[PDB]
Design a binder for this molecule. Structure first.
Ligand SMILES: CC(C)[C@H](CO)Nc1nc(Nc2cccc(Cl)c2)c2ncn(C(C)C)c2n1
Length: 297
């Protein structure tokens, strides 16, 4: 039987750098998530992720981390078990979300991203698969959590205490569908890029797709370039037709300077004012409420 530490039992695979396992804290009768990485790995990422989680600390919508240590031939990280991702739930809702659902998601994720940034980190891996509700049934099912900090970076260098310098010729980080235009161009990512990728994701949810999806090329590099070219060639006014506030959001974040602190309040208020004008109540009645939600246990 595979164990981590004195008390965490490692169970079945629930997903796939490394595997994700269902685990159980035997001391407390609580299920947990256990991320495994082979000790033999070329390019380990698990210890770096654990360090980022520790830097984030205890925050709203940040998964709790319980243990890091060896587990047979693996390094193991034991964390809070969460429910389905936004991609999973998007599929469950026939691949569109209502405006009310997208705004409840957006308001929370602007805050989630402000929190990450307040801990001197940029995220660099925005995608619907990395935002998870809490376990169906529990007190945090309503909370949209952010996971997977393997691609994060300290944007304030603790050596200098200053913002990281601008540079280019960076290897492309994250998912092509959502990444910022400046990420496509090989520029160092900063706070602006996290918020721009969120914007793309919001429009994906609202539209059901993005116009640069399904572009193919003979190489990965050429494919990224084509997606980038289409992002640049698609006017914000067109992409965000019928969603004026989203156009305002996207234009704002696209125009941020590399070093600039986003005005998180301004962006939230774009969406909360809209939310109010539409007469929505922030009651966490997402589109998926009432549906059969997948569960890890
Ligand atoms: C393995 C992936 C498909 C999913 C979604 O990205 N990842 C995932 N699923 C989690 N839960 C999960 C996995 C499969 C089905 C269901 Cl319903 C939930 C999960 N719980 C905690 N974390 C991290 C904080 C380690 C998690 N990460």
């Amino acid at each position: 039987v595979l164990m981590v530490g004195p008390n965490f039992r490692v169970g079945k695979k629930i997903g796939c750098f490394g595997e994700l396992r269902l685990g159980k804290n035997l001391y407390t009768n609580e299920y947990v998530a256990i991320k495994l990485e082979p000790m033999k790995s070329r390019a380990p990422q698990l210890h770096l992720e654990y360090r980022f989680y520790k830097q984030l600390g205890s925050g709203d919508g940040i998964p709790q981390v319980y243990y890091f240590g060896p587990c047979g031939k693996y390094n193991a990280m034991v964390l809070e078990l969460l429910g389905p991702s936004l991609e999973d739930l998007f599929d469950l809702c026939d691949r569109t979300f209502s405006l009310k659902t997208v705004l409840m998601i957006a308001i929370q994720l602007i805050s989630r991203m402000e929190y990450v940034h307040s801990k001197n980190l940029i995220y660099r891996d925005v995608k619907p698969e990395n935002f998870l509700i809490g376990r169906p049934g529990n007190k945090t099912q309503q909370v949209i959590h952010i996971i997977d900090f393997a691609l994060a970076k300290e944007y304030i260098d603790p050596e200098t205490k200053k913002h990281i310098p601008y540079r280019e010729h960076k290897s492309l980080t994250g998912t092509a569908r959502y990444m910022s235009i400046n990420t496509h161009l090989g520029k160092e990512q900063s706070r602006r890029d996290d918020l721009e990728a969120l914007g793309h994701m919001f429009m994906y949810f609202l539209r059901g797709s993005l116009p640069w999806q399904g572009l193919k090329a003979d190489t990965l590099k050429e494919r990224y370039q084509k997606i980038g070219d289409t992002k640049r060639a698609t006017p914000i006014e067109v992409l965000c037709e019928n969603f004026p506030e989203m156009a305002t959001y996207l234009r704002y974040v696209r125009r941020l300077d590399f070093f600039e602190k986003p005005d998180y309040d301004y962006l939230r208020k774009l969406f909360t004012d809209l939310f109010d004008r539409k007469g929505y109540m922030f009651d966490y009645e997402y589109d998926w409420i009432g549906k059969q939600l997948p569960t890890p246990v």
